[PDB]
């Protein structure tokens, strides 16, 4: 139950290098962190249909096929898809949105036809339709004939694919509503996965993954950086590390003679990233994920707020019991209440109460500020 | 005497059927004679007659292979006729089944078929199967091709060709759709309506010649997506037995310019030259949408070609066109008129019995555990379409596999046999799947059925009698109205305090006549007002007409009747046939704010005041609501009824919910302390302490004054 | 199939006569126009609600004339490959020209030459230009007549409605009782009807049904009969018993069921219809009856006197008074007396036109009125529009009318003061007429009229009820009688279930009237009378 598949390289000093223990693809599960639940869901929905197809025969069900990942850009959807495909080690046909859209008229559909036909021929296969929105935007966005021919061809191929063939289709799109609504029905991209911005632990994992090759100085406190960085998606963290390294080299440029093509080996080997460089990079960087609504976790307990004991008890009775003990609610047959409305003077800490409620049920927190 | 009971044949012959001696005399047959046996749907074969005295009168023996071929089980009935004209197959090609030739070496022909065809004279027919036991194994073979056709005898003169690809067993049903009426559940009236218009013109074409009429050709089905419309069309086509052709919408709209017309023309002519035939056009709205949507030249030429082809077949008979869409107002209006989809059929979400039937149909291959209460699921799952039910079953199975994943490993390409032997889904998995389900049919107006009688409506019995007079008599006994020449009143209006039992009242009124029920809540009215909804008032009334009789309930009518929406509603009401039993029932809390135009005669004129429930009504409500909750023995609700003066039904429900919440809180606290299966009186006292009326006295007196003024 | 001669059409004497006298003579007897030296009109434009038999009429006329015929469908012509539609049109026209005499039927012309607004595409412009060029170039050609069928006259491009083009216009209106009876007889000339058939009753009951709707009704009734007799039919048997097959026969109840399961739609939009109400369904108002007779009948029946004196008959009239006084019935009777068609435009239709969500338009309404002249246009509850774009369009159309043409606009409204004064000016709806509530004798006459189709207990005098209904509008008495009938049917059903009640009784009337009310408040009546006297003082020297 839950994340049950995660428990237990890339199907592969000289021996360690050969066994993997510019184009360094085949990034395994190690190269991803901070998205354990979503990765578990994707693995559960991808591997078992292909790796172990006899279970479904034994139980007698038709496994779902369409999988639709969506989340803020830069969270690593493509990375997750590629990692899963390489781990499964099956015929992997990759299709991009703009890449197909850039073809001449009448050739952006034959490519899809041949792609699906080949995937069927060499089953088991995994198809990753990256940036599916570009080839299937909202119905009102595109009125041109080609923009509907492509969508109709995609729908026909998807409907025809539903069969015994062990082929799974995965699509990625930042905006869940941007996709044509007709693509989200039974027999199509039904199962949906949401990617949210990582938390402090996720940020620490991402920073460790990226900051493994850099000549980090001893005075580095990656824990502090993870604590300070809030709302930074993985791409933002990678950019932060790159900017910090750039700042370090810029500081060391004093002893570097740009005129000479080569540099003294001692100077090249003396590069070291300092905490101040990371702080400067944080100052320069500018995240943009928070500009739009996103899913994130919170870790506020009933100690960062004061008083409101009766209010805390009321909120507990309202939310916790339905979540922790639905069995008794079913026993009494009473469905739990849906929503709650806090009112009072401004500045009393309603946001902290909401975050605490979310934390107690261990549920993700979505916010919609007034300007939104 | 061609109907005989099915029995399990002891022998191991797939082309031998045993009959009783008396039965053999009745059928006028001889031992060893070949006879043709036809079973369910359009499947039939030929079997060698055998004499069996042990067989009881009206009984026959057939092995499992014959039953599988005929799509029948033990104890079924078949039609048997003499088959003396069967000839000898001069040349037959037969190929083995793939799964039956797993690693079997040597000349399969000589090893298996040759002993099985040494002067056996076993009758064969196209598509038949037979299993031959050779050595310690058994191999199945299928009748791939025969000459002369169709059914003949495999004698020595026959030339057997056993060269060809193995016949994979999966593709027989995976790549082919063989679904009968038994695969459809919860929709019987719609199935009967489709059959009486599809089979009758084809199976019995001489009846219309005898009565000298031209039966309607077009048939337009519509309803919420996922209700099985395509499955219904497939089942009807298969049961009819006539040649079936499918014209998928997006498939025909996803080809180079000038070729979609070619595909449509080819399909129509091919259907024409194979009369009788069925043409099914799935997702018609994709190729022929409303004018405001499609403006390009190609998307209009396609529609023009479709109209031309459809109008070109009204002379030729034995062909019927069946469409499919989600909304009636989602296709070009020119397609809905005489000669083009005259008949309209509406499919709505199923009821409890339909949901149970769907669950039984889907959960006939799953390995369910003993502790399953499918009836309980059907009761709980409301608003779920068949697709949602299938998704629920798949999710439950996935949850079961996930739970069993602890005892298995992700390595290897095989799983331990014992682990696979233990796959059993339990009720917890179904509840979890329900938790993770995402029903969407209710997001838009749909037609459903209700099962409320004069049982859950306490008080206001005079209103019950008035509704009876208004509704029941016109529908059940129109003869009296015709005798007096009185057109029955169309609709009714309800006004009064909110939460006094109006929705369930309308549901009960619809139930009495046994008619479908459509609901249009306030938010839907606002969405249609802003024109950001996918449905329009005209669409609602067209669906109501299609599913007639129906009751259209307009909740919170004052939110929009304070305009475009009111004008559209009034026009639709006026353009309503008198004889059709389509009743419009409106509800509101501000009868003054309602536009007077609606209240005119021939419209929502009969105003009815819904008074606050009386003490007896309050007692009835309390008894009804707690009908499914453990109550403390000896509880007296008369005191609550007395003390709950001025409380609406919603208020009583709130009090009961709060009492149950306190009781469950105490129970869970006690359990965590480590008992409380009853809801004590003190719980009701606790709920009362913090409960009060939600209806102001000012509003009550204003409603009373308005009712008195209307009475005066 | 073909050979659908004049015997396959009924209830359309006027339109068939017009089309015949316009088509046959140019083709059958071309020498007449040589002798009199005129140029017979070529273009013809038939338009009306769908399913009224336009194509059937055209085919019947062509077959009876016995001339070369060519059929053109808008859809198929528009469904060809780009650049093929023009070729097909050129072919068709050349073939028709070469085989003179000839007839061309451009069915669904609006689908190939739509309103200019919806002609954004290039191909539409090309096709329209090709059609216009072909038509204009046909003037040199002779012995060729073009007929076009369109849903409404405002849908085709305006350029197609000039001299030398589809100038002659014909309007197809819904049929009346006699037409529906004739259609029923025509369709039911082969069905194995049972002896107990009352086709006349069906015709009387079915109002507003078009020929197509009647055909569908017959098919549905036959289907119901087959379904009912199916109990003796098993789907298993391939062979059908001869006795069972012969036993089939439709009955009246089958037709009633089919009527129950029918969906007419002609009345959904404004359509020219015929009415046959005389000076009997309305009682009292004798002065108003005589005034309307003088106003309308004399200009129509005796134009010679007006020509002698040069008077121009008034165009329209306006009725004001309490609602439910029978204004619509009075207008229908007025139309009946002059033997002119009737067009009704209810208030919701006017609001829809205001909001521009309705296909029809004021200009279209008046074009149909002209094509169906003489006619009586009826604008109900003008107050809802005269609280304006709609008012301006109406005024322009009303001013732009031929005096000789017998088109009269009759307005009804309960708020004469709120009506825009511009409408009351001379040459418009200036003749106001007050419609008071019925008198005692009027009430008795109304009661008798509404009871001509209901059995009654002998000796049931209605004078007491008439006297006890002072100031009650016709709708009030209708409500009272309907309530009495409702109580009678209630008692009859109760007795039947307990088992009697074959006719109404005075006690039922007493029970129904015990809960009656006056639909018009006294204050409204006072205001109406004050306004009437004020207007009287405006013309009461
Ligand atoms: N666990 C991780 N989560 C998020 N980003 C990660 C993670 N590990 C590494 N990254 C880095 O984050 C960036 C993710 O790039 P990627 O192309 O996957 O993003 P995306 O927005 O999902 O892509 P797409 O263009 O396909 O929509 C890369 O720099 C990758 O190196
Ligand atoms: N009686 C039933 N009603 C509804 N669904 C059913 C029924 N019996 C089986 N099903 C299952 O419900 C699903 C219906 O899928 P299907 O695509 O045929 O429906 P649909 O809504 O008619 O389709 P579409 O409009 O996309 O052509 C299938 O899983 C079918 O097996
Ligand atoms: N007198 C009649 N008037 C009208 N319809 C009749 C009459 N007699 C029979 N019918 C039947 O009514 C139907 C009229 O359909 P028809 O196609 O003629 O109508 P339409 O709207 O003019 O056609 P279209 O727009 O397709 O050219 C046909 O079934 C015709 O057989
Ligand atoms: N118990 C508390 N009562 C009032 N304010 C608090 C409490 N705990 C924290 N805060 C402060 O309140 C601020 C946010 O106030 P909050 O009420 O959540 O938002 P808003 O002021 O918009 O309603 C934070 O900066 C936080 O430091
Ligand atoms: N006959 C009844 N009269 C009043 N309330 C009832 C009756 N029967 C049950 N109730 C309860 O009272 C509630 C009142 O709300 P409801 O009738 O659903 O809303 P509304 O009256 O606005 O249509 C019902 O939901 C139900 O729980
Ligand atoms: N002489 C009459 N005076 C008043 N009403 C009559 C008369 N004769 C018949 N009626 C009734 O009047 C009704 C028509 O009402 P109408 O005047 O059209 O309402 P409105 O005033 O809203 O137009 C018909 O149902 C008819 O039964």
From Swiss-Prot, chain A:
Primary location class: other
Keywords carried by this UniProt record: ATP-binding, Cell cycle, Chaperone, Cytoplasm, Endoplasmic reticulum, Hydrolase, Isopeptide bond, Microsome, Nucleotide-binding, Phosphoprotein, Protein transport, Repeat, Transport, Ubl conjugation
Consequence of substituting residue 131 to D: Severe loss of catalytic activity without affecting cooperativity between the 2 ATP-binding regions. Slight reduction in growth rate
Other facts: Present with 78400 molecules/cell in log phase SD medium.
Cited function: ATP-dependent chaperone which probably uses the energy provided by ATP hydrolysis to generate mechanical force to unfold substrate proteins, disassemble protein complexes, and disaggregate protein aggregates. By recruiting and promoting the degradation of ubiquitinated proteins, plays a role in the ubiquitin fusion degradation (UFD) pathway. Has a role in the endoplasmic reticulum-associated degradation (ERAD) pathway which mediates the cytoplasmic elimination of misfolded proteins exported from the ER.
UniProt subcellular location: Microsome; Endoplasmic reticulum; Cytoplasm
From-to range in the entire protein, with total length: 22 to 556 of 835
GO molecular function terms attached to this record: ATP binding; ATP hydrolysis activity; identical protein binding; polyubiquitin modification-dependent protein binding; protein phosphatase regulator activity; ubiquitin binding
Domain of life: Eukaryota
Subunit structure: Component of the heterotrimeric CDC48-NPL4-UFD1 ATPase complex. The CDC48-NPL4-UFD1 ATPase complex interacts with the HRD1 ubiquitin ligase complex composed of the E3 ligase HRD1, its cofactors HRD3, USA1 and DER1, substrate recruiting factor YOS9 and CDC48-binding protein UBX2. Interaction between the complexes is mediated by interaction between CDC48-NPL4-UFD1 complex member CDC48 and HRD1 complex member UBX2. Forms a complex composed of CDC48, NPL4, UFD1, UFD2 and SHP1.
Cross-linked sites for Glycyl lysine isopeptide (Lys-Gly) (interchain with G-Cter in ubiquitin): 121, 138, 162, 338, 355
One record GO biological process: positive regulation of protein localization to nucleus
Annotated positions binding ATP 2: 347-352
The family this protein is said to belong to: Belongs to the AAA ATPase family.
Reported effect, residue 131 to Q: Severe loss of catalytic activity and cooperativity between the 2 ATP-binding regions. Lethal. Restores cell growth
Keyword field contains Thylakoid: no
Phosphoserine PTM positions: 288, 335
Effect of residue 174 to A: Slight reduction in growth rate. Restores cell growth
Sites where the protein binds ATP 1: 73-79, 174, 210
GO cellular component: Cdc48p-Npl4p-Vms1p AAA ATPase complex; cytosol; Doa10p ubiquitin ligase complex; endoplasmic reticulum membrane; Hrd1p ubiquitin ligase ERAD-L complex; mating projection tip; mitochondrion; nucleus
Protein name stated in the entry: Cell division control protein 48
Keyword Ubl conjugation: yes
């Amino acid at each position: 139950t839950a994340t049950a598949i995660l428990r237990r390289k890339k199907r592969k000093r000289v021996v360690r290098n050969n066994l993997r223990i510019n184009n360094m693809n085949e990034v395994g599960y190690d190269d991803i962190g901070g998205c354990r639940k979503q990765m578990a869901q994707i693995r559960e929905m991808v591997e078992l249909p292909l790796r172990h197809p006899q279970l479904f025969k034994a139980i007698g069900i038709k496994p779902p096929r369409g999988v639709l990942m969506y989340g803020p850009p830069g969270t690593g959807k493509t990375l997750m898809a590629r990692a899963v495909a390489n781990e499964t080690g099956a015929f992997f046909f990759l299709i991009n949105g703009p890449e197909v859209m850039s073809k001449m008229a009448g050739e952006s559909e034959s490519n899809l036809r041949k792609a699906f036909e080949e995937a069927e021929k060499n089953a088991p296969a995994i198809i990753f339709i990256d940036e599916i929105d570009s080839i299937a935007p909202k119905r009102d966005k595109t009125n041109g004939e080609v923009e509907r021919r492509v969508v109709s061809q995609l729908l026909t191929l998807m409907d025809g694919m539903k069969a015994r063939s062990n082929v799974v289709v995965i699509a990625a799109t930042n905006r869940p509503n941007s996709i044509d609504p007709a693509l989200r029905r039974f027999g199509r991209f039904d199962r949906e996965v949401d990617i949210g911005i990582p938390d402090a632990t996720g940020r620490l994992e991402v920073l460790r993954i990226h900051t493994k090759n850099m000549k980090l100085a001893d005075d580095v406190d990656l824990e502090a950086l993870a604590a300070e960085t809030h709302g930074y998606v993985g791409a933002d963290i990678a950019s932060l590390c790159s900017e910090a390294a750039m700042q370090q080299i810029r500081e060391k440029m004093d002893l570097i003679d740009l005129d000479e093509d080569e540099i003294d080996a001692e100077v090249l080997d003396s590069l070291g990233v300092t905490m101040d460089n990371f702080r400067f990079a944080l100052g320069n960087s500018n995240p943009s994920a928070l500009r739009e609504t996103v899913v994130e976790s919170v870790n506020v307990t009933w100690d960062d707020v004061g008083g409101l004991d009766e209010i805390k008890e009321e909120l507990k009775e309202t939310v916790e019991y339905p979540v922790l003990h639905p069995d008794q609610y079913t026993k009494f047959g009473l469905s739990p209440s849906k929503g709650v409305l806090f009112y009072g003077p401004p500045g009393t800490g309603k946001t902290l109460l909401a975050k605490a409620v979310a934390t107690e049920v261990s549920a993700n927190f979505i916010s919609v500020k007034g300007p939104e | 005497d061609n109907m005989l009971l099915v029995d399990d044949a002891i022998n191991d012959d797939n082309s031998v059927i045993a009959i009783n001696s008396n039965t053999m005399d009745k059928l006028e047959l001889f031992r060893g004679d070949t006879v043709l046996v036809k079973g369910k749907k359009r499947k039939d074969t030929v079997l060698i007659v055998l004499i069996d005295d042990e067989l009881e009168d009206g009984a026959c023996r057939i092995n499992r292979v014959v039953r599988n071929n005929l799509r029948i089980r033990l104890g079924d009935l078949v039609t048997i006729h003499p088959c003396p004209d069967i000839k000898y197959a001069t040349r037959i090609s037969v190929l083995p089944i793939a799964d039956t030739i797993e690693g079997i070496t040597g000349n399969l022909f000589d090893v298996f078929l040759k002993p099985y065809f040494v002067e056996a004279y076993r009758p064969v027919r196209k598509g038949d199967h037979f299993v031959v036991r050779g050595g310690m194994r058994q191999v199945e073979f299928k009748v791939v091709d025969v000459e002369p056709e169709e059914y003949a005898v495999v004698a020595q003169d026959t030339i057997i060709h056993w060269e060809g690809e193995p016949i994979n067993r999966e593709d027989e049903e995976n790549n082919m759709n063989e679904v009968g009426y038994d695969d459809i559940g919860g929709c019987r009236k719609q199935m009967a309506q489709i059959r009486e218009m599809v089979e009758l013109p084809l199976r019995h074409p001489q009846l219309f010649k005898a009565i000298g009429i031209k039966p309607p050709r077009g048939v337009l089905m519509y309803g919420p997506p996922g209700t099985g419309k395509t499955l219904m069309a497939r089942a009807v086509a298969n049961e009819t037995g006539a040649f079936f052709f499918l014209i998928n919408g997006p498939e025909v709209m996803s080809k180079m310019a000038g070729e979609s017309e070619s595909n449509l023309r080819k399909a129509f002519e091919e259907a024409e030259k194979n009369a009788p035939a069925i043409i099914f056009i799935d997702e018609i709205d994709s190729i022929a949408p409303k004018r405001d949507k499609t403006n390009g030249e190609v998307e209009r030429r396609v529609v023009s070609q479709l109209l031309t082809l459809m109008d070109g077949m009204k002379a030729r008979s034995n062909v019927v066109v069946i469409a499919a869409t989600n909304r009636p107002n989602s296709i070009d209006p020119a397609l809905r008129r005489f000669g083009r989809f005259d008949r309209e059929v509406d499919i709505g979400i199923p009821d409890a019995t339909g949901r149970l039937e769907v669950l039984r149909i889907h959960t006939k291959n799953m390995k369910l555990a003993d502790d399953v209460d499918l009836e309980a699921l059907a009761a709980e799952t409301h608003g779920y379409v068949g697709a949602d039910i299938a998704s629920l079953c798949s999710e439950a199975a996935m949850q079961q596999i996930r739970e069993k994943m602890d005892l298995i490993d992700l390595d290897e390409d095989e799983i331990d046999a014992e682990v696979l032997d233990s796959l059993g889904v339990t009720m917890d998995n179904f509840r979890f799947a329900l938790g993770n389900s995402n029903p969407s049919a209710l997001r838009e107006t749909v037609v459903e059925s209700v099962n409320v009688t004069w049982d859950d409506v306490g008080g206001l019995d005079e209103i019950k009698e008035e509704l009876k007079e208004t509704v029941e008599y016109p529908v059940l006994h129109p003869d009296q109205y015709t005798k007096f020449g009185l057109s029955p009143s169309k609709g009714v209006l309800f006004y009064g305090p909110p939460g006094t039992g109006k929705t369930l009242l309308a549901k009960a009124v619809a139930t009495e006549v046994s008619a479908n029920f459509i609901s249009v809540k306030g938010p839907e009215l606002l969405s249609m007002w802003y024109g950001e909804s996918e449905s329009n008032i005209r669409d609602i009334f067209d669906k109501a007409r299609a599913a007639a009789p129906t009751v259209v309930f307009l909740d919170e009518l004052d939110s929009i009747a304070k305009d475009r929406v009111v004008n559209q509603l009034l026009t639709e009401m006026d353009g309503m046939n008198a004889k059709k039993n389509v009743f419009v029932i409106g509800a509101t809390n501000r009868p003054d704010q309602i536009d007077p135009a609606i209240l005119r005669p021939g419209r929502l004129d009969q105003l009815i005041y819904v008074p606050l429930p009386d003490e007896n009504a309050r007692l009835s409500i309390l008894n009804a609501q707690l009908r499914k909750t453990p109550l403390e023995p000896g509880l007296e609700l008369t005191a609550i009824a007395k003390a709950t003066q001025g409380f609406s039904g919603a208020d009583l429900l709130y009090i009961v919910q709060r009492a149950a919440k306190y009781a469950i809180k105490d129970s869970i606290e006690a359990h965590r302390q480590h008992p409380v299966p009853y809801i004590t009186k003190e719980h009701f006292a606790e709920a009362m302490k913090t409960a009060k009326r939600s209806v102001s006295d000012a509003e009550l007196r204003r409603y009373e004054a308005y009712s008195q003024q209307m009475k005066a």
